[PDB]
């Protein structure tokens, strides 16, 4: 039989996944980045203005 080996035949399955690409859907969510410092400022200001 074929005795050929490589770091691939000795390896592990790559544990790969698909990541969201925005193709082949009707709409795409707006990419709204919100860091925690901005969440703190909103929540502090809301609680002050109440």
């Amino acid at each position: 039989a074929n005795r050929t080996v490589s770091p691939s035949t000795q390896g592990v399955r790559p544990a790969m996944r698909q990541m969201y690409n925005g193709r082949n859907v009707a709409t795409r969510p707006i990419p709204l980045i919100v860091d925690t410092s901005e969440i703190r400022a909103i929540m502090a200001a809301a609680a002050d203005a109440r």
Binding site: R23, A26, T27, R28, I30, L32, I39, A41
Partner: protein, 100 residues
Amino acid sequence: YVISHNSVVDSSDLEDLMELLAEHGYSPQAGTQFLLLANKAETDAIRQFRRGVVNNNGATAGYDFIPSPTQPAMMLPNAEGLLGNQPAPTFGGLAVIGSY
């Protein structure tokens, strides 16, 4: 209480109008729902906003106009979906034409 500085509406005017609420923190980040009330003369221009296409006064739209479920259909122009979210067909009791 403000003016557009142009005789016909831009996508930039919806951005400048959104800014007047967001400057106080009333914002998409804060989970604020937003409603725009407009006349036919304005909504019939706003229906034509498409991402990256130039509108009136050299404004370029940063989002797509997404029609509401009650509106007539459109063909999707690209393999990429429209940039936006499709609205519910009503806001309170009002009839929603779409989102921007």
